[PDB]
């Protein structure tokens, strides 16, 4: 029997997009989806609704919280420092969520962040499902009970090693453990410290789910199931679905003028702005490679145009070989273009999947975020599908020479590290695209959802 599922993702394109990818897969199986989305953002999402008779959008008015810029709905609309206020605004949709649930009456609601929700749903006879599109290795590392019980005694040296029982080994740099130790305590919406919030969601929800498959995410989901004592499901790897919009002709035309596999694509997601010095170092490192490149970057901190922040003489030197662009582009379609030979990525969970299912060599440039860092360690050291750009142990900065070297290594047909990461990437792509991998993940996922509402 088909399920009625409501979708309440965090107000971020990196959550809205994979929730919609998964929605399409569930609707193909006959399930009815009530998709809650910020009102103005809906128009950008219709693009991806492949089953409009089963997937219905319901608009949310993102309320006012003092400090929130006017009209802002998504982390793509605000600077990263304003994220906690946007969290307070999502907390404030409670009364209009509670009324949407009362009239739509879904059996299950997938959600992010709103740890108050399982108390509404238990009252309405609805099952709460905390559905993560970030890595379970990240939640396992920072938010498992052993971490939470040390409370404010948790230090940088504590975060340098995994929590007790953690199934895997990898190394953090000093500045990364420093980042995790401090940001953990910073308020993220309505006065709740960040890790407390996520922990409250894990503890109070009926069940948990993650993007991923047993072959890669398995050990972390088993660890989390053992720790929290409730089902931790895997949706499958949420392979990107095809959009209804073709590749913009101006990009298709420009990309079509380069030799196959010759272009370096660089993008750091839609939520981040580099500091100027690292913006310069990145762009000069791309220039040093001599390869054509497309860099999708916001202007650096303190700057409003790409023009004003480019290193001196940059435009005149790179000529038609390189473009630096700050607008939203169709990243998934660009990564499928045969010109692209290399993807320099901030290691966001969605960008990681998009690179894995394509042919591009991966260069890992994780930005200062626990999931990006952990994704980078897993891709660089466990799966060994990419080369990570070296950062200063204490300052977290890279040089233009380190960017150049990483790209050169993976682009060199005769370099043995490049051949190795190509070979390992092919292994992972062949697994994720295996004819029965995602479908069998979804088979199990949907059975376990049926048990949940039984
Ligand atoms: O990056 C993280 C993250 O997601 C991310 O949290 C950012 C705020 O810190 C936000 O800006 C991004 O849009 C979002 O993808 C979340 C998260 C996401 C959805 C949830 O339902 C609950 C938690 O937990 C984290 C926990 C960590 O120990 C470290 C992290 O790095 C993240
Ligand atoms: O100009 C852009 C920037 C991002 N994306 C998409 O936005 C999502 C970004 O998610 P990810 O987790 O990689 O990073 P974030 O942007 O949340 O940091 C992915 O599906 C990208 O393909 C896109 O299509 N165009």
Short mmCIF file of C-alpha atoms and ligand atoms in Angstrom, two decimals:
data_model
loop_
_atom_site.label_atom_id
_atom_site.label_comp_id
_atom_site.label_asym_id
_atom_site.label_seq_id
_atom_site.Cartn_x
_atom_site.Cartn_y
_atom_site.Cartn_z
CA UNK A 1 0.00 0.00 0.00
CA UNK A 2 1.31 3.43 -1.00
CA UNK A 3 2.44 5.91 1.66
CA UNK A 4 1.70 9.60 2.10
CA UNK A 5 4.98 11.28 3.04
CA UNK A 6 5.52 14.93 3.87
CA UNK A 7 8.94 16.50 3.22
CA UNK A 8 10.24 19.31 5.47
CA UNK A 9 13.90 19.92 4.54
CA UNK A 10 16.12 22.66 5.89
CA UNK A 11 16.04 25.92 3.91
CA UNK A 12 19.10 25.19 1.79
CA UNK A 13 19.49 24.20 -1.85
CA UNK A 14 21.77 21.34 -0.68
CA UNK A 15 18.81 19.90 1.23
CA UNK A 16 15.92 20.86 -1.05
CA UNK A 17 17.54 19.34 -4.14
CA UNK A 18 18.26 15.80 -2.77
CA UNK A 19 14.94 15.72 -0.92
CA UNK A 20 13.33 16.35 -4.31
CA UNK A 21 15.52 13.74 -6.03
CA UNK A 22 14.33 11.20 -3.45
CA UNK A 23 10.73 12.44 -3.74
CA UNK A 24 10.79 11.63 -7.46
CA UNK A 25 12.06 8.10 -6.72
CA UNK A 26 9.35 7.55 -4.13
CA UNK A 27 6.64 8.90 -6.42
CA UNK A 28 7.77 6.60 -9.21
CA UNK A 29 6.91 3.81 -6.73
CA UNK A 30 3.38 5.23 -6.23
CA UNK A 31 3.95 7.16 -3.01
CA UNK A 32 2.26 10.54 -2.51
CA UNK A 33 4.56 13.38 -1.45
CA UNK A 34 3.56 16.62 0.26
CA UNK A 35 6.66 18.80 -0.23
CA UNK A 36 6.95 21.81 2.09
CA UNK A 37 9.08 24.58 0.61
CA UNK A 38 9.73 28.30 1.09
CA UNK A 39 7.21 30.20 -1.03
CA UNK A 40 9.44 32.03 -3.51
CA UNK A 41 11.87 29.10 -3.74
CA UNK A 42 9.13 26.85 -5.15
CA UNK A 43 9.49 28.41 -8.61
CA UNK A 44 13.11 27.23 -8.73
CA UNK A 45 12.06 23.69 -7.74
CA UNK A 46 9.31 22.97 -10.32
CA UNK A 47 12.21 22.18 -12.68
CA UNK A 48 12.74 18.94 -10.80
CA UNK A 49 9.17 17.77 -10.10
CA UNK A 50 8.89 14.83 -12.49
CA UNK A 51 5.62 13.50 -10.96
CA UNK A 52 3.40 16.56 -10.40
CA UNK A 53 0.30 14.39 -9.96
CA UNK A 54 1.90 12.75 -6.87
CA UNK A 55 4.30 15.43 -5.62
CA UNK A 56 2.55 18.62 -4.51
CA UNK A 57 4.42 21.69 -3.25
CA UNK A 58 3.02 23.50 -0.20
CA UNK A 59 4.47 26.99 0.33
CA UNK A 60 5.86 28.19 3.65
CA UNK A 61 6.12 31.87 4.53
CA UNK A 62 9.54 32.24 6.11
CA UNK A 63 8.75 34.45 9.13
CA UNK A 64 10.66 37.51 10.26
CA UNK A 65 13.47 37.19 12.78
CA UNK A 66 15.36 40.38 13.57
CA UNK A 67 18.52 40.43 11.48
CA UNK A 68 17.19 38.24 8.68
CA UNK A 69 17.47 40.12 5.37
CA UNK A 70 14.15 40.89 3.74
CA UNK A 71 12.66 38.16 1.56
CA UNK A 72 15.41 35.67 2.42
CA UNK A 73 14.27 32.06 2.27
CA UNK A 74 17.38 29.86 1.81
CA UNK A 75 21.04 29.76 2.82
CA UNK A 76 21.71 30.79 -0.81
CA UNK A 77 20.16 34.16 0.13
CA UNK A 78 22.17 34.92 3.29
CA UNK A 79 25.77 34.94 4.40
CA UNK A 80 26.89 31.95 6.45
CA UNK A 81 26.94 34.01 9.66
CA UNK A 82 23.16 34.51 9.33
CA UNK A 83 22.40 30.78 9.29
CA UNK A 84 21.38 30.65 12.98
CA UNK A 85 18.76 33.35 12.42
CA UNK A 86 17.36 31.43 9.46
CA UNK A 87 17.14 28.46 11.84
CA UNK A 88 15.09 30.58 14.24
CA UNK A 89 12.77 31.42 11.32
CA UNK A 90 12.34 27.72 10.48
CA UNK A 91 11.57 27.06 14.15
CA UNK A 92 8.87 29.73 13.81
CA UNK A 93 7.01 27.92 11.01
CA UNK A 94 5.74 25.60 13.74
CA UNK A 95 2.18 26.88 13.82
CA UNK A 96 1.83 26.77 10.05
CA UNK A 97 3.47 23.33 9.88
CA UNK A 98 1.10 22.07 12.59
CA UNK A 99 -1.83 23.24 10.49
CA UNK A 100 -0.44 21.71 7.31
CA UNK A 101 -0.08 18.35 9.05
CA UNK A 102 -3.55 18.52 10.57
CA UNK A 103 -5.22 18.89 7.17
CA UNK A 104 -2.92 16.80 4.95
CA UNK A 105 -2.55 13.95 7.48
CA UNK A 106 0.61 12.27 6.11
CA UNK A 107 1.68 8.95 7.56
CA UNK A 108 5.34 10.05 7.89
CA UNK A 109 7.18 13.37 7.81
CA UNK A 110 10.84 13.59 6.73
CA UNK A 111 12.54 16.56 8.38
CA UNK A 112 15.72 18.45 9.29
CA UNK A 113 16.65 20.26 12.51
CA UNK A 114 13.19 20.93 14.06
CA UNK A 115 13.42 18.80 17.21
CA UNK A 116 10.05 20.09 18.39
CA UNK A 117 8.33 18.24 15.54
CA UNK A 118 8.25 14.68 16.98
CA UNK A 119 6.02 16.02 19.81
CA UNK A 120 3.49 17.42 17.30
CA UNK A 121 3.57 14.25 15.21
CA UNK A 122 3.22 11.76 18.08
CA UNK A 123 0.07 13.66 19.04
CA UNK A 124 -1.30 13.46 15.47
CA UNK A 125 -0.44 9.80 14.97
CA UNK A 126 2.26 10.74 12.43
CA UNK A 127 5.71 9.12 12.47
CA UNK A 128 8.72 11.46 12.55
CA UNK A 129 11.68 10.58 10.32
CA UNK A 130 14.90 12.56 10.67
CA UNK A 131 16.36 12.36 7.15
CA UNK A 132 19.97 13.46 6.68
CA UNK A 133 21.54 14.19 3.33
CA UNK A 134 24.94 14.74 4.99
CA UNK A 135 27.36 11.90 5.78
CA UNK A 136 26.46 9.57 8.70
CA UNK A 137 30.19 9.52 9.35
CA UNK A 138 29.85 13.19 10.34
CA UNK A 139 26.91 12.78 12.70
CA UNK A 140 28.64 9.69 14.14
CA UNK A 141 31.80 11.67 14.80
CA UNK A 142 30.33 14.79 16.44
CA UNK A 143 26.87 13.99 17.79
CA UNK A 144 26.92 10.41 19.09
CA UNK A 145 26.06 10.06 22.80
CA UNK A 146 29.68 9.70 24.00
CA UNK A 147 30.36 13.15 22.55
CA UNK A 148 27.26 14.72 24.06
CA UNK A 149 27.79 13.44 27.63
CA UNK A 150 31.12 15.24 27.92
CA UNK A 151 28.95 18.40 27.53
CA UNK A 152 31.10 21.57 27.70
CA UNK A 153 34.15 19.54 28.79
CA UNK A 154 34.66 18.53 25.13
CA UNK A 155 37.88 20.08 23.82
CA UNK A 156 39.88 20.36 20.60
CA UNK A 157 42.11 17.48 21.63
CA UNK A 158 38.96 15.45 22.35
CA UNK A 159 37.73 16.03 18.80
CA UNK A 160 41.11 14.97 17.40
CA UNK A 161 40.12 11.34 17.99
CA UNK A 162 36.88 9.48 17.18
CA UNK A 163 34.24 8.76 19.82
CA UNK A 164 34.24 5.38 21.52
CA UNK A 165 33.15 2.60 19.17
CA UNK A 166 33.55 4.68 16.00
CA UNK A 167 33.98 2.13 13.18
CA UNK A 168 36.67 3.86 11.13
CA UNK A 169 39.99 5.77 11.41
CA UNK A 170 40.95 9.10 9.86
CA UNK A 171 42.97 12.14 10.91
CA UNK A 172 41.84 15.72 11.45
CA UNK A 173 44.18 18.68 11.36
CA UNK A 174 44.52 20.91 14.42
CA UNK A 175 42.52 23.79 12.94
CA UNK A 176 39.69 21.42 11.97
CA UNK A 177 39.34 20.00 15.47
CA UNK A 178 39.47 23.59 16.76
CA UNK A 179 36.62 24.51 14.43
CA UNK A 180 34.50 21.55 15.52
CA UNK A 181 35.14 22.21 19.23
CA UNK A 182 34.06 25.86 19.05
CA UNK A 183 31.20 25.87 16.53
CA UNK A 184 29.53 22.95 18.33
CA UNK A 185 28.57 25.32 21.15
CA UNK A 186 27.41 28.25 19.01
CA UNK A 187 23.67 28.93 18.98
CA UNK A 188 21.88 27.75 15.83
CA UNK A 189 18.30 28.96 16.08
CA UNK A 190 16.23 29.98 19.08
CA UNK A 191 19.15 29.84 21.51
CA UNK A 192 19.91 26.12 21.08
CA UNK A 193 23.60 25.18 20.67
CA UNK A 194 24.24 23.52 17.31
CA UNK A 195 25.13 20.01 18.46
CA UNK A 196 22.42 20.05 21.15
CA UNK A 197 19.83 20.69 18.42
CA UNK A 198 21.00 17.82 16.21
CA UNK A 199 21.23 15.59 19.26
CA UNK A 200 17.69 16.52 20.29
CA UNK A 201 16.49 15.53 16.79
CA UNK A 202 18.31 12.18 16.97
CA UNK A 203 17.00 11.41 20.46
CA UNK A 204 13.33 12.37 19.96
CA UNK A 205 12.59 11.24 16.41
CA UNK A 206 10.85 7.91 15.82
CA UNK A 207 13.45 6.83 13.26
CA UNK A 208 16.48 8.15 11.36
CA UNK A 209 17.55 7.92 7.72
CA UNK A 210 20.58 8.90 5.67
CA UNK A 211 21.46 9.29 2.03
CA UNK A 212 23.83 6.46 1.17
CA UNK A 213 24.33 2.72 0.64
CA UNK A 214 25.58 -0.17 2.76
CA UNK A 215 28.80 -0.43 0.77
CA UNK A 216 29.97 3.06 1.83
CA UNK A 217 27.77 4.42 4.65
CA UNK A 218 26.98 1.03 6.24
CA UNK A 219 29.44 1.04 9.16
CA UNK A 220 28.30 4.49 10.31
CA UNK A 221 24.59 3.67 10.13
CA UNK A 222 25.22 0.47 12.13
CA UNK A 223 27.14 2.48 14.73
CA UNK A 224 24.33 5.03 14.97
CA UNK A 225 21.64 2.34 15.20
CA UNK A 226 23.54 0.67 18.03
CA UNK A 227 24.04 3.99 19.85
CA UNK A 228 20.53 5.44 19.56
CA UNK A 229 18.61 2.12 19.64
CA UNK A 230 16.13 3.02 16.86
CA UNK A 231 16.06 2.30 13.11
CA UNK A 232 18.66 4.11 11.04
CA UNK A 233 17.70 3.63 7.40
CA UNK A 234 19.55 4.13 4.11
CA UNK A 235 17.65 5.73 1.21
CA UNK A 236 20.22 4.68 -1.37
CA UNK A 237 22.74 7.17 -2.77
CA UNK A 238 20.08 9.59 -4.17
CA UNK A 239 21.38 9.51 -7.73
CA UNK A 240 20.53 12.84 -9.41
CA UNK A 241 17.38 12.75 -11.52
CA UNK A 242 17.20 14.49 -14.88
CA UNK A 243 15.85 18.04 -14.89
CA UNK A 244 13.16 19.26 -17.25
CA UNK A 245 15.47 22.14 -18.29
CA UNK A 246 18.23 21.62 -20.87
CA UNK A 247 21.76 22.96 -20.40
CA UNK A 248 21.87 26.72 -20.96
CA UNK A 249 23.00 27.27 -24.54
CA UNK A 250 25.66 29.83 -23.57
CA UNK A 251 27.40 27.30 -21.34
CA UNK A 252 26.87 24.41 -23.75
CA UNK A 253 28.34 26.47 -26.57
CA UNK A 254 31.36 27.63 -24.56
CA UNK A 255 32.05 24.20 -23.07
CA UNK A 256 31.75 22.63 -26.52
CA UNK A 257 34.80 24.51 -27.76
CA UNK A 258 37.27 22.60 -25.57
CA UNK A 259 38.88 19.21 -26.12
CA UNK A 260 37.29 16.28 -24.30
CA UNK A 261 38.44 16.02 -20.70
CA UNK A 262 40.56 19.16 -20.84
CA UNK A 263 38.58 21.59 -18.64
CA UNK A 264 38.83 22.06 -14.87
CA UNK A 265 35.46 22.80 -13.22
CA UNK A 266 35.67 24.41 -9.77
CA UNK A 267 32.71 25.15 -7.51
CA UNK A 268 32.24 25.60 -3.76
CA UNK A 269 28.49 25.27 -3.46
CA UNK A 270 25.99 28.06 -2.92
CA UNK A 271 26.51 28.99 0.77
CA UNK A 272 30.13 30.14 1.02
CA UNK A 273 32.32 33.12 0.23
CA UNK A 274 36.11 32.76 0.28
CA UNK A 275 38.39 35.31 1.90
CA UNK A 276 40.21 37.38 -0.70
CA UNK A 277 43.64 35.86 -0.20
CA UNK A 278 42.35 32.31 -0.68
CA UNK A 279 40.18 33.45 -3.60
CA UNK A 280 43.38 34.76 -5.19
CA UNK A 281 45.36 31.64 -4.34
CA UNK A 282 42.69 29.36 -5.82
CA UNK A 283 42.36 31.32 -9.07
CA UNK A 284 46.11 31.72 -9.57
CA UNK A 285 46.55 28.00 -8.95
CA UNK A 286 43.99 27.20 -11.64
CA UNK A 287 45.85 29.59 -13.96
CA UNK A 288 49.18 27.89 -13.23
CA UNK A 289 47.87 24.57 -14.57
CA UNK A 290 47.49 25.93 -18.10
CA UNK A 291 44.19 24.10 -18.42
CA UNK A 292 40.97 25.83 -19.42
CA UNK A 293 38.76 26.27 -16.37
CA UNK A 294 35.33 27.30 -15.18
CA UNK A 295 35.25 28.61 -11.59
CA UNK A 296 31.80 29.15 -10.02
CA UNK A 297 32.55 31.35 -6.99
CA UNK A 298 30.90 34.11 -5.04
CA UNK A 299 32.95 37.32 -4.77
CA UNK A 300 35.21 37.14 -1.72
CA UNK A 301 34.41 38.59 1.69
CA UNK A 302 34.19 42.37 1.44
CA UNK A 303 33.72 42.37 -2.34
CA UNK A 304 30.55 42.55 -4.45
CA UNK A 305 31.77 41.75 -7.98
CA UNK A 306 34.14 39.14 -9.36
CA UNK A 307 35.77 41.87 -11.49
CA UNK A 308 36.96 43.89 -8.50
CA UNK A 309 38.47 40.90 -6.69
CA UNK A 310 40.41 39.19 -9.48
CA UNK A 311 44.21 39.25 -9.08
CA UNK A 312 45.88 41.98 -11.11
CA UNK A 313 46.08 41.24 -14.84
CA UNK A 314 44.15 37.98 -14.39
CA UNK A 315 41.50 38.62 -17.07
CA UNK A 316 44.07 39.76 -19.65
CA UNK A 317 46.20 36.65 -19.06
CA UNK A 318 43.61 33.87 -19.06
CA UNK A 319 41.80 35.38 -22.09
CA UNK A 320 39.14 32.92 -23.35
CA UNK A 321 40.69 29.95 -21.50
CA UNK A 322 39.03 30.71 -18.16
CA UNK A 323 35.79 32.09 -16.77
CA UNK A 324 35.06 33.07 -13.17
CA UNK A 325 31.29 33.33 -12.64
CA UNK A 326 29.18 34.07 -9.52
CA UNK A 327 25.68 33.06 -10.67
CA UNK A 328 23.76 29.84 -10.05
CA UNK A 329 24.53 27.38 -12.86
CA UNK A 330 23.25 23.89 -13.76
CA UNK A 331 26.13 22.11 -12.03
CA UNK A 332 24.81 18.59 -12.61
CA UNK A 333 24.62 19.16 -16.38
CA UNK A 334 28.05 20.79 -16.49
CA UNK A 335 29.64 17.83 -14.71
CA UNK A 336 28.15 15.52 -17.36
CA UNK A 337 29.70 17.55 -20.16
CA UNK A 338 32.55 15.69 -21.92
CA UNK A 339 34.86 18.74 -21.74
CA UNK A 340 35.17 18.42 -17.96
CA UNK A 341 38.23 16.46 -16.87
CA UNK A 342 38.61 17.68 -13.29
CA UNK A 343 36.24 18.79 -10.51
CA UNK A 344 37.70 20.95 -7.73
CA UNK A 345 35.03 20.63 -5.05
CA UNK A 346 34.29 21.97 -1.56
CA UNK A 347 33.15 18.40 -0.73
CA UNK A 348 29.50 19.17 -0.11
CA UNK A 349 27.51 15.95 0.06
CA UNK A 350 25.52 16.70 -3.11
CA UNK A 351 28.54 17.78 -5.15
CA UNK A 352 30.36 14.63 -4.02
CA UNK A 353 27.60 12.41 -5.44
CA UNK A 354 27.49 14.43 -8.66
CA UNK A 355 31.22 14.00 -9.15
CA UNK A 356 31.24 10.31 -8.24
CA UNK A 357 28.64 9.40 -10.87
CA UNK A 358 30.60 11.19 -13.59
CA UNK A 359 34.03 10.71 -15.16
CA UNK A 360 35.81 13.85 -13.87
CA UNK A 361 38.90 13.50 -11.70
CA UNK A 362 38.22 14.79 -8.18
CA UNK A 363 40.33 17.40 -6.38
CA UNK A 364 39.22 17.86 -2.80
CA UNK A 365 39.13 21.41 -1.43
CA UNK A 366 36.91 21.00 1.66
CA UNK A 367 35.78 24.23 3.23
CA UNK A 368 35.53 24.73 6.99
CA UNK A 369 32.53 22.54 7.83
CA UNK A 370 32.49 19.16 9.56
CA UNK A 371 30.70 17.34 6.76
CA UNK A 372 32.93 18.78 4.04
CA UNK A 373 36.05 17.83 6.01
CA UNK A 374 34.88 14.31 6.81
CA UNK A 375 33.69 13.77 3.22
CA UNK A 376 37.14 14.87 2.09
CA UNK A 377 38.93 12.44 4.41
CA UNK A 378 36.70 9.55 3.37
CA UNK A 379 37.06 10.30 -0.34
CA UNK A 380 40.80 10.99 -0.13
CA UNK A 381 41.94 8.32 2.32
CA UNK A 382 39.29 5.58 2.39
CA UNK A 383 37.76 5.39 -1.07
CA UNK A 384 40.87 7.16 -2.53
CA UNK A 385 38.84 8.66 -5.38
CA UNK A 386 40.39 12.13 -5.22
CA UNK A 387 43.46 14.16 -4.26
CA UNK A 388 43.09 16.66 -1.40
CA UNK A 389 44.75 20.09 -1.55
CA UNK A 390 47.17 20.55 1.37
CA UNK A 391 46.13 23.07 4.08
CA UNK A 392 48.27 24.59 6.84
CA UNK A 393 47.93 22.46 9.98
CA UNK A 394 47.14 25.45 12.22
CA UNK A 395 45.96 28.18 9.79
CA UNK A 396 43.81 26.10 7.41
CA UNK A 397 45.06 28.02 4.37
CA UNK A 398 46.30 26.69 1.04
CA UNK A 399 48.85 27.97 -1.44
CA UNK A 400 48.37 28.46 -5.15
CA UNK A 401 51.13 25.88 -5.62
CA UNK A 402 49.14 23.25 -3.69
CA UNK A 403 46.07 23.83 -5.89
CA UNK A 404 48.23 23.62 -9.00
CA UNK A 405 49.91 20.39 -7.86
CA UNK A 406 46.66 18.59 -7.05
CA UNK A 407 45.12 19.41 -10.43
CA UNK A 408 48.33 18.60 -12.29
CA UNK A 409 48.58 15.21 -10.57
CA UNK A 410 45.06 14.08 -11.48
CA UNK A 411 45.15 15.54 -15.03
CA UNK A 412 48.46 13.81 -15.92
CA UNK A 413 47.68 10.58 -17.81
CA UNK A 414 51.15 9.32 -16.85
CA UNK A 415 51.01 10.16 -13.12
CA UNK A 416 50.54 7.06 -10.99
CA UNK A 417 48.49 8.77 -8.25
CA UNK A 418 46.25 10.19 -10.97
CA UNK A 419 45.77 6.77 -12.54
CA UNK A 420 45.02 5.29 -9.12
CA UNK A 421 42.33 7.81 -8.20
CA UNK A 422 40.83 7.43 -11.67
CA UNK A 423 40.71 3.65 -11.20
CA UNK A 424 39.18 3.91 -7.73
CA UNK A 425 36.65 6.50 -8.90
CA UNK A 426 35.63 4.10 -11.67
CA UNK A 427 35.10 1.35 -9.06
CA UNK A 428 32.86 3.62 -6.97
CA UNK A 429 30.93 4.93 -10.00
CA UNK A 430 30.33 1.36 -11.18
CA UNK A 431 28.94 0.47 -7.74
CA UNK A 432 26.69 3.51 -7.37
CA UNK A 433 25.35 3.10 -10.91
CA UNK A 434 25.00 -0.70 -10.70
CA UNK A 435 21.67 -1.69 -12.24
CA UNK A 436 20.27 -2.98 -8.94
CA UNK A 437 22.08 -0.86 -6.33
CA UNK A 438 19.77 2.12 -5.90
CA UNK A 439 16.62 0.09 -6.59
CA UNK A 440 17.50 -2.49 -3.94
CA UNK A 441 18.38 0.28 -1.50
CA UNK A 442 14.95 1.76 -2.13
CA UNK A 443 13.29 -1.67 -1.86
CA UNK A 444 14.63 -2.02 1.68
CA UNK A 445 14.03 1.66 2.50
CA UNK A 446 10.36 1.44 1.58
CA UNK A 447 9.88 -1.86 3.46
CA UNK A 448 11.33 -0.30 6.61
CA UNK A 449 9.12 2.77 6.18
CA UNK A 450 6.14 0.39 5.96
CA UNK A 451 7.25 -1.25 9.22
CA UNK A 452 7.53 2.22 10.76
CA UNK A 453 3.86 3.01 10.10
CA UNK A 454 2.80 -0.51 11.06
O1 LIG B 1 27.08 20.48 8.14
C1 LIG B 1 26.39 19.96 9.05
C2 LIG B 1 25.01 19.82 8.93
O2 LIG B 1 24.33 20.36 7.85
C3 LIG B 1 24.65 21.70 7.49
O3 LIG B 1 24.61 22.58 8.61
C4 LIG B 1 25.03 23.93 8.27
C5 LIG B 1 25.01 24.76 9.53
O4 LIG B 1 26.12 24.50 10.37
C6 LIG B 1 24.10 24.50 7.20
O5 LIG B 1 24.57 25.79 6.80
C7 LIG B 1 24.04 23.59 6.00
O6 LIG B 1 23.05 24.07 5.09
C8 LIG B 1 23.71 22.16 6.40
O7 LIG B 1 23.84 21.30 5.27
C9 LIG B 1 24.28 19.21 9.94
C10 LIG B 1 22.84 18.92 9.95
C11 LIG B 1 22.08 18.91 8.79
C12 LIG B 1 20.73 18.59 8.82
C13 LIG B 1 20.14 18.22 10.02
O8 LIG B 1 18.82 17.88 10.08
C14 LIG B 1 20.90 18.18 11.18
C15 LIG B 1 22.24 18.51 11.14
O9 LIG B 1 24.92 18.68 11.03
C16 LIG B 1 26.26 18.82 11.22
C17 LIG B 1 26.77 18.28 12.38
C18 LIG B 1 28.14 18.41 12.58
O10 LIG B 1 28.67 17.92 13.72
C19 LIG B 1 28.97 19.01 11.62
C20 LIG B 1 28.42 19.52 10.47
O11 LIG B 1 29.21 20.10 9.54
C21 LIG B 1 27.03 19.44 10.24
O1 LIG B 2 25.66 27.13 -8.90
C1 LIG B 2 25.29 26.09 -8.36
C2 LIG B 2 25.65 25.66 -7.04
C3 LIG B 2 25.16 24.50 -6.57
N1 LIG B 2 24.34 23.69 -7.32
C4 LIG B 2 23.78 22.45 -6.74
O2 LIG B 2 23.51 22.74 -5.39
C5 LIG B 2 23.76 21.56 -4.58
C6 LIG B 2 24.82 21.93 -3.59
O3 LIG B 2 24.82 20.93 -2.58
P1 LIG B 2 26.20 20.57 -1.86
O4 LIG B 2 25.87 19.68 -0.72
O5 LIG B 2 27.21 20.12 -2.87
O6 LIG B 2 26.71 22.01 -1.37
P2 LIG B 2 26.15 23.43 -0.79
O7 LIG B 2 25.81 24.34 -1.95
O8 LIG B 2 24.95 23.09 0.08
O9 LIG B 2 27.33 23.94 0.02
C7 LIG B 2 24.18 20.46 -5.58
O10 LIG B 2 23.09 19.64 -5.98
C8 LIG B 2 24.74 21.27 -6.76
O11 LIG B 2 24.67 20.60 -8.00
C9 LIG B 2 23.93 24.05 -8.59
O12 LIG B 2 23.21 23.34 -9.28
N2 LIG B 2 24.45 25.23 -9.04
#
